[PDB]
Design a binder for this molecule. Structure first.
Ligand code: BCL
Ligand code: BCL
Ligand code: BCL
Ligand code: BCL
Ligand code: BCL
Ligand code: BCL
Ligand code: BCL
Ligand code: BCL
Ligand code: BCL
Ligand SMILES: COC(C)(C)C/C=C/C(C)=C/C=C/C(C)=C/C=C/C(C)=C/C=C/C=C(C)/C=C/C=C(C)/C=C/C=C(C)/C=C/CC(C)(C)OC
Ligand SMILES: [Ca+2]
Ligand SMILES: [Ca+2]
Lengths: 53, 40, 52, 53, 40, 53, 42, 53, 40, 53, 40, 52, 40, 40, 53, 40, 53, 42, 52, 42, 53, 53, 40, 53, 42, 52, 40, 41
């Protein structure tokens, strides 16, 4: 809609930005945790070579 | 919130352009991650 | 046709905050629920197994 | 009776609506979990085909 | 609650109509679910 | 007696209705949980057809 | 009185309460009849 | 005695009825749980027939 | 409690009537339960 | 003594009645549970017949 | 407690009557229980 | 002979309440103690065993 | 405590009478228990 | 809430439009997920 | 000394009597429990005869 | 404590007499217990 | 020294007596606990005779 | 003084305290003599 | 080009404190995470084993 | 403004913040280049 | 030094005496318990004779 | 920039110094503990000679 | 503490005398304990 | 320096003395336990003669 | 100025802070050089 | 050369108290750490075992 | 602390003297302990 | 800030430096003795 800019007359910009930043950082950490525990792991998969040997 | 109307317009413009830049960077990163390790 | 008066009872700001929080929590919960079944897309060796 | 519309002169409409919404969401989640626990499961039942294979 | 009589009557009308719509949706959903997996 | 309608001059109607609603909902949930655990279960009894096989 | 209700209000509330409770009991009785016709327990 | 009706000049009626109702409901639940655990159980006793088999 | 004497008399009458009705219902229910599943 | 009726000029009647009622109910429950555990049990003793069979 | 002397007399009379009735009921119940299941 | 002045130091009502509570608790405790010895009167199969 | 002297005398008399009655009841009960189940 | 009637109408219009856009996105995503990994 | 009666000008008689009574009751209970655990027990020692037989 | 001197004398006399009676009762009880079950 | 009686101008007599009596009772109980657990026990040593034969 | 006692009261309390402490110690000594005559420990 | 107004909403001091704390915590977390994989640089016997 | 800063102060702070952030990112990039030259992970 | 008597113009005598008494009692108990657990025990050492046997 | 010295018009120097000192001490302890558990240990590696043996 | 100089001096004298008596008692007790059970 | 006596114009003497006394007592106890735990024990080492035997 | 320091005080504090930090980093570098000379880890 | 002004920011009393407490705690910690390694001086049977 | 300068001098003198006496006693005790059980 | 003047800071700094240097000298001597007893590196 063209009159969507009035959303900032209801929501306080400062809290919106702080919540966005915190939620994005937490989501990044959580998704990295989730991906690390599958077969898509990039650290402990001996590519290119194995270094503990 | 106490904001006027012109301030709301300016904040909306800057917020939209920043969100679009962030989404573009995320899309590029996901393109690289798909070119490296396809998951689907 | 007079449903637009629902905002004369419910405060819009709290409604929007609750909707956003509930939708995010529901998305997380459903993704975790689906991950644990046989519909998993990460640890299902498609297209290729990478650890091996 | 035909004078049932006076129930809103005793109960506050706002709290009634909030309680209804919360109770319905909680009941929906609970019933979906209960149905998932039984043998009517639709996710992990290998229909139409097993995917972890 | 502070509500007058006309406001109570209007709220009752709208509440009844919305509850009936919700119940119709629920009935259709259970019809589909029964057509998929009969439980009884 | 025929003068029972004075029971609302001692008990407040609003709290009476709220307590009735809450108690009935809790009782319904509790009775369903109790009946589910016996041999009257309607979900996990393979009727009409077993779906996980 | 204690609650503040008058006498006519008490009469009206009693009438509506009795009607609603009887409707609820009728619905419960019908549901139990159906449940007995499906899965007898006694 | 015949002057027992003065018992309500010492005990407040409203709290008396609230306590009676709560105590009776709790006693009913307790007696049902006690009876269920004995050999007088009516649910899991395979009468008239067995439904899980 | 603040109740007068006539109010006490009326409350006692109604309380006695209700308690007797409740006891009669319990007695009938126990008669049916004994007819179904004797315990003693 | 014959002047024992003065005991109510020292002890408040209302709390006396409330304490008596509560103590008697608790004692009844406790004695029924204690008797149930011994060999005087009347529920799970297969008299007149056994119903779980 | 604030009670007068006549009120104390009346309360004592009613209390003794009720206590004796309760004890009579308990005695009858124990007689029946002994006739059913002797314990001593 | 002047022992009756003991009630000018101790409050009568608290004395009676404490006496009643202590006696009830003592009765319960002594019945528990006796119930766990070979003086038990309930689970001693006299006059006859009922769970048989 | 605020009690006078005559009140103290009366309370002491009634207290002693009640204590002696209670002790007599206890003694009779213990006599019956000894004739039933000697412990010493 | 303190809102007037015109503000209520405007908020309702924007809320419904945004909710419909969100639902359209959800149904497109579910169509893609069904074309990838059927579950029913 | 002969002026020991002044000991009540320092110690409050009421608390002295309350403490004495409480301590004596607690000591009686404690000594009875201590003696019951040794071979001086008078209850479970089969004298004069054994009743659980 | 607020007690005078005559009150102190009276309380001391009664306290000593009661303590001596209690000790005599304890001594008699211990004599009986020794006659039943010698421990030393 | 000969002027030791001034120690009561520093220490309050009442608390001194209360502390002395409490500490002595606690010490008596503790020393009986300690002695009962050694081979100096007087209760459970079968002297003069064993009563729980 | 901190406690509020005068000098004569201090002297009297000291005399009575010493007398009572000596009596208590004498009783303890007699009891220990009897306990040694029964069960020597050292 | 008017992004410099972001400091008229966010307080400069708390922003700097939060950045410093978050960066330190992230550095510790990533070093610990890397230490537990096969990219470990301490316990890999390179260039030589010292305990042996 | 809510924070109380003027416009010129905001401009100066933004300039210095950008300069410092870019220097920090340059150092991070150099460190990651060295770490890749030592132990390739991808 | 000869001017050590001024140490009571800094430390309050009453608390000093109370702390000394408490610390000495605790130390005495602690040292007796420590010595009891070594081979210097005087109670359970069968000297001059065993009493339980 | 060359106007970095204005950073002390925003951050209080005293708290900055205290935080720096505390963080450096904690980091030193943490890093000295982390290295000790690896094969770079300098204490328990029998160099130059074993002392317990 | 509020003490004057003479009070401090008197307290010091008595404190030293009492501490020396306590130490003498301790020394005698350890002499006896060494004559019974030599630990060193 | 020779002006070290000004250290008492910063540190309060009373708390300094109390802290020194408490720290020294705690250190003495701790070092005694540590030395007892090791091979330098003087109590349970059967020197000069073995008691308990 | 939130912290209440003048411009000259800020300049002097920055100078001293920079000097002390550089000295600390020099000591750290020397210590790490010695540690690498003794026990190489990379 | 103007380093003597650090006491115009930091309070000397708390500085000395913190220094003393930290040094005592560090001394205790390092002695415990050294005791548990093979550099122990108490239980190393030098110059002679005493409980033997 | 409120102390003057002469009081500081006096306290320093006494503190140093007492600390040196304490250290002398500790040194003597450690000499005896080394003469009994050498540890180094 | 702390209330000290400009000369008190100089005096405190001088005494603090002297005491810290003495403490470090004692530590160095103790570590020298420990190295002559138990060489750890
Ligand atoms: C093989 C190893 C060697 C050894 C190697 C070394 C080396 C190397 C060093 C020491 C040092 C010390 N060793 Mg060593 N040491 C050994 C074995 C011991 C044994 C033992 C029983 O085995 C003991 C008791 C000690 C004790 C000591 C201390 C004398 C000293 C540490 C003091 C300190 O930390 O300063 C504390 C500093 C302060 C400034 C404290 C000031 C005191 C204040 C006034 C106290 C007030 C109390 C305060 C406020 C706290 C309050 C507490 C609460 C009220 C409870 N070592 C063995 C034999 N040891 C160190 C040393 O000598 O330093 C000179 C040192 O460098
Ligand atoms: C086989 C299963 C599929 C899959 C099946 C589905 C299905 C079906 C759906 C999703 C949806 C989502 N999936 Mg998916 N998804 C998969 C795996 C993932 C993984 C992962 C690491 O594996 C991640 C991180 C995600 C993440 C996401 C989100 C983009 C989205 C849920 C957001 C939400 O809750 O909105 C709630 C948030 C708000 C209400 C806040 C307001 C919205 C804000 C302002 C806008 C942000 C973008 C918005 C979420 C739109 C998303 C579209 C994206 C551009 C793709 N999916 C796999 C590959 N996924 C849902 C979706 O697409 O919604 C449109 C959805 O219906
Ligand atoms: C074999 C079993 C079927 C199944 C059988 C049923 C049956 C039967 C029902 C549902 C219903 C629902 N199912 Mg289903 N459902 C299945 C698996 C799922 C899965 C999943 C990941 O597997 C999800 C996420 C859902 C989710 C849903 C919700 C859309 C809905 C419950 C919402 C609610 O409680 O409203 C409570 C919320 C309120 C009252 C708030 C007020 C209304 C708000 C503003 C709007 C709510 C959105 C509305 C519910 C959307 C409905 C549109 C379509 C019917 C989807 N189902 C499987 C495939 N499901 C119920 C339903 O459809 O209701 C209409 C229902 O009766
Ligand atoms: C073999 C056993 C049968 C079964 C035997 C029975 C019997 C017998 C009864 C029920 C009753 C109920 N059952 Mg059933 N029920 C079964 C399995 C289910 C399952 C399931 C997922 O398996 C669900 C979700 C339900 C749900 C329900 C509810 C509709 C109802 C309890 C509501 C309540 O407590 O009102 C309490 C709430 C209030 C008092 C609030 C006031 C009223 C509010 C405003 C509206 C309430 C909703 C109303 C009950 C809707 C009626 C729907 C129709 C009856 C279908 N049953 C199986 C299939 N069920 C009871 C009932 O039907 O009551 C009429 C009942 O007597
Ligand atoms: C072999 C053992 C017997 C048995 C032996 C006894 C004996 C002996 C006694 C009881 C008594 C009671 N038993 Mg029974 N009882 C048995 C099995 C049961 C069963 C069951 C499900 O098995 C239940 C629910 C009960 C319950 C009861 C109560 C009716 C009553 C205790 C009430 C009370 O504590 O008053 C305390 C409450 C108050 C003081 C409140 C004041 C009074 C209030 C206003 C009314 C109280 C209700 C009144 C007691 C009802 C009496 C009517 C008839 C006597 C039944 N019994 C079995 C069959 N039972 C006691 C009794 O009958 O008392 C008269 C009693 O002496
Ligand atoms: C082999 C071991 C001996 C034994 C060896 C000793 C030795 C040795 C001593 C005791 C002492 C006591 N023993 Mg013993 N004791 C044994 C077994 C017992 C048993 C038991 C059930 O087995 C009991 C209950 C006791 C109880 C007692 C107390 C009478 C007394 C400790 C009271 C106290 O702490 O003073 C604290 C009292 C107060 C603070 C109150 C102040 C005084 C009051 C006003 C006067 C009341 C009487 C008072 C307790 C004096 C006791 C003398 C009695 C007349 C016997 N002993 C066995 C037989 N017992 C101690 C004692 O006799 O003290 C004189 C004592 O020295
Ligand atoms: C195989 C993996 C490599 C390794 C790969 C990397 C990579 C890649 C990086 C580091 C980075 C760091 N590594 Mg490394 N690192 C390894 C092993 C170590 C070990 C160790 C004992 O093994 C230590 C102590 C460190 C420590 C460090 C820090 C210097 C730095 C993280 C600081 C920070 O989070 O700033 C956050 C603090 C702030 C933002 C506060 C503001 C700045 C303050 C005022 C000054 C900070 C000092 C600055 C970071 C020093 C950098 C100079 C040199 C790079 C040393 N690494 C192993 C050997 N390391 C990061 C880095 O170098 O950043 C430049 C980095 O990108
Ligand atoms: C093999 C080991 C020896 C033994 C070796 C020693 C040695 C060595 C000592 C003691 C000392 C004591 N022993 Mg011993 N002791 C043994 C077994 C016991 C047993 C027991 C049941 O076995 C008991 C109860 C005691 C009790 C006692 C106390 C009398 C005293 C510690 C009190 C105290 O800490 O004062 C602290 C209290 C205060 C400072 C408060 C102030 C003073 C108050 C007002 C009065 C206190 C009473 C005073 C201690 C009386 C002492 C007189 C005689 C010495 C008995 N010992 C065995 C037999 N015992 C210590 C002692 O005799 O001190 C003089 C002591 O040095
Ligand atoms: C093989 C591994 C080496 C080793 C490798 C390293 C390396 C690499 C480093 C250290 C550093 C340190 N090591 Mg080392 N270290 C080893 C084993 C030890 C042992 C031990 C018992 O084994 C101890 C107690 C220490 C202690 C120390 C500290 C002196 C210092 C860390 C202090 C700090 O965090 O400053 C933080 C404190 C502040 C910021 C407060 C202000 C400082 C005050 C005013 C001045 C105090 C002295 C200061 C710490 C400088 C020390 C002078 C000399 C370098 C000793 N190391 C072994 C032998 N160690 C670090 C260092 O030397 O820094 C200079 C360092 O880079
Ligand atoms: C104000 O007053 C006026 C003027 C009105 C006058 C009125 C005065 C009146 C009416 C006064 C009345 C006074 C009364 C009735 C007083 C009664 C006093 C009594 C009964 C006192 C009894 C005292 C008993 C004592 C103190 C006994 C003490 C025993 C002790 C401490 C025993 C300890 C034993 C131990 C620790 C044993 C341990 C050994 C074991 C074996 C338990 O260890 C495991
Ligand atoms: Ca890799
Ligand atoms: Ca050694």
């Amino acid at each position: 809609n063209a009159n969507l800019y009035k959303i900032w007359l209801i929501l306080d910009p400062r809290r919106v930005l702080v919540s966005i930043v915190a939620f994005q950082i937490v989501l990044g950490l959580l998704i990295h945790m989730i991906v690390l525990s599958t077969d898509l792991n990039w650290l402990d998969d001996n590519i290119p070579v194995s270094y503990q040997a | 919130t106490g904001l006027t109307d012109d301030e709301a317009k300016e904040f909306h413009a800057i917020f939209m352009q920043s969100m679009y830049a962030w989404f573009g960077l995320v899309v590029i990163a996901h393109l690289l991650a798909w070119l490296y390790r396809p998951w689907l």
